[PDB]
């Protein structure tokens, strides 16, 4: 790791086993469900400001070795050039995500810089590493659970969309997309529901959710609907 | 209609009650497939060029009592203010779209500009008026059929965009969404197929209809396929 | 271990012991799988920047009295002339790798030249130890299961060749040889199509994997193939 002194320098220190270790026996397998480990990497890559060496215990001790290589080569394959397009020139994507330790020096504006980028591209590597092969029919599986609330909901139809589609659902882009899936993949009371909404063009995917929300939210309890059975009074 | 004239002045005269008659004759009902005659009228709001009357003619033939009303409120509802926002003053909206008579005199650039204007909201008027209530199942019922080639059904699946959906399956925003549509309710050996294309993320709606058709082309023969059982040779 | 103090000065201070038995703990021991460990103080000896003394710990406390002998002596035989060459002269020997305390002293950069010396022949002592009799058996023995990935199935493959060959499956040089032995020795249905790719002498290992991988990604569902019969109407 990495911080800024009080004099005003950065100073080193190497990460506590005991925190790499915590990280990795807290959360899920890289394979079993990415996002966990990404969000973590992605963090610690920020406040602990590692160096190529810290990387490479990073990964080393959160992936198996057959997630490491995936990761790195698809963090070489996120690589540009200075025309912001992708390229496989050997020097290009040797300079910007070394498999060897780098003489970088953090001293080093220089040595700052190639820091920076590298740990941008290790977290592209390990976002598209998560990703899965494209399959559709895993998004339209995703069906609101009689009692899951439409946020929760939602947060499941967007990690589908992450883990079998190219799409991210976060997109500006994507918004009407996922609002579809949304809509049609709502319980049933609440689809028909947002489906007549007026001005439904206008709805945000946060407006949607609102308004599944005031139907979800009127669930209309076990109890009260019993009760109202008993005071039925109808008979046959 | 009006033309330019031999002398380069505008030249006017009367639709023949021959072409209203048969443009009526030869489409559906508005209610029945908007989408018919709005696309006939567009034409002919540019071939030729008709006045405010002119358009009355169109719109009184060629629509019922109760379809020009939705038409005319839906052009009026669509006129925008000098600040290119909605509006509902009823001055700005009857000098867009007037109910009644205007004084636009087309040999003036005044009267030709109002005229355009006139022309384009009675356009948006019959787009608009031809939405129906947003359905999303009605989009999501839309499946391949098994002798449908891929292009004839992605165009019966943006027909179902247009009259259930406020989305325009053309607008560049929504391709990701109806491509995921395509791919999910195409004919199952063709989604299937499409959902493993390497680069996915990469294809365009039209790169998505050429690899179905090239499965769809490999449609594999009824007689081919007797033959081959035939010499199949391999009893039970 | 060793750090650039924030006045430009190496700072000193023990190994945590906190650190040394997870390390140990979390790990197989070096006989049972030599990689692990190896990876873990390959790491080490760059983040913690060990002294001699450390590198004793580290030694002392990861590897039996049997597993540390045969270390020192590999990083022993592993010392080099001036001329490049190996070198069996006690006194060349006793220089690079001391088995009693030397008196570097990490403030000059005649100390830190040795240690880091040191530290690179612990490494390749702990490299070649960590090789086991020469066992071609075992490398035609790694054959690729039914649910096994062509990733996973190369790195079992390599470290095959790590464990029972003196061949460095990473060398380039023996690149062909790693890519005949997986060929032949992935799943059957995906050997044969390897066997006849277009310009196969061109394929890189990496680009074998990615070919194999198309196979193995067309895996054809269990319940999409039972689907099919289902469907089959062929009776018998």
Chains 1, 2, 3 share one sequence.
């Not at 790195?72 to 397009?85: F, I, T, Y």
Request: hydrophobic letters at 30%; one cysteine or more; glycine letters at 6%.
């Amino acid at each position: 790791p990495l911080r800024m002194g009080g004099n005003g320098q950065l100073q080193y220190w190497p990460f506590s086993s005991s925190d790499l270790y915590n990280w990795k026996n807290n959360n899920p397998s890289f394979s079993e469900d990415p996002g966990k480990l990404t969000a973590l990497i992605e963090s610690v890559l920020t406040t602990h400001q590692p160096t190529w060496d810290d990387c490479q215990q990073l990964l080393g001790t959160l992936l198996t070795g057959e997630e490491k290589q995936r990761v790195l080569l698809e963090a070489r394959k996120a690589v540009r050039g200075n025309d912001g397009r992708p390229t496989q020139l050997p020097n290009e994507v040797d300079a910007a995500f070394p498999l060897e330790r780098p003489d970088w020096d953090y001293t080093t504006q220089r040595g700052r810089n190639h820091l920076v980028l590298y740990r941008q591209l290790l977290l592209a590597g390990m976002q598209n590493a998560g990703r899965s092969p494209t399959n559709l029919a895993k998004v339209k599986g995703i069906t609101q659970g009689p009692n899951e609330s439409p946020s929760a909901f939602l947060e499941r139809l967007k990690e589908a969309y992450r883990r079998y589609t190219p799409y991210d659902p976060e997109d500006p882009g994507q918004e009407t997309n996922v609002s579809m899936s949304f809509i049609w993949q709502s319980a049933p009371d609440i689809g028909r529901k947002l489906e007549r909404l007026e001005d439904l063009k206008s709805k945000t995917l946060g407006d949607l959710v609102r308004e599944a929300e005031k139907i979800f939210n009127k669930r209309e309890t076990p109890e009260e609907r019993e009760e109202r059975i008993r005071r039925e009074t109808e008979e046959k």
